[PDB]
């Protein structure tokens, strides 16, 4: 009598959706992964004594113009929205995505969190921790920063989204 969460991973293009997800499930940082591929990864994690069966949707990517059709919500238990702290564009884009996603959802409390990835690039960082935090807060969302190089930060991210579901249960 375990539970089952299905998580949508959303974000611009080359912000590390795949790399972050793969890191969590394989224990491995990959060099490249094909950015056409939508793939569902699976994983066990135990959270507050409850064994969870995760399905992780590594979406191909979105942008400003992308379209969230009415059906997308259907069987989605949670949404993780990812930008890169090195691409202002990806931060621009994630605000837009959030807007369209919040419209496609309507009223429901199905949790949404926000992640600043690529934190390991001290020299390439353009977005501050504060900047993304303010966004999350503005949405009443969770906010973590991450690195697909670092396993433990990835674990925090997919663990946190489950937590955020549990809050509302
Ligand atoms: N240094 C660093 N590179 C990353 C990180 N996350 C992703 N990358 C790299 O950025 C590119 C995009 O990764 P990917 O997961 O394919 O992004 P996606 O297109 O959103 O799935 C790849 O070249 C990765 O090797 C990170 O946290 N740190
Ligand atoms: Mg990808």
UniProtKB/Swiss-Prot annotation:
Post-translational modifications: Farnesylation is important for efficiently activating mTORC1-mediated signaling.
Site entry: Important for autoinhibition of GTPase activity: 33
Documented effect of changing residue 47 to A: Causes slightly reduced phosphorylation of EIF4EBP1
Effect noted on mutating residue 62 to L: Has a higher basal GTPase level, however, is still sensitive to TSC2 GAP activity. Increases affinity for MCRS1
Predominant location category: membrane
Residues recorded as bearing Phosphoserine in the entry: 128
Entry binding sites for GDP: 14-19, 30-31, 117, 120, 148
Principal EC category: hydrolase
Any GO BP annotation: positive regulation of TORC1 signaling
Recorded family membership: Belongs to the small GTPase superfamily. Rheb family.
Note: The conserved catalytic Gln-62 found in other Ras-like GTPases seems not to be involved in GTP hydrolysis in RHEB.
NCBIfam families given in the database record: small_GTP (TIGR00231)
Name of the featured protein: GTP-binding protein Rheb
Organism for this UniProt entry: Homo sapiens
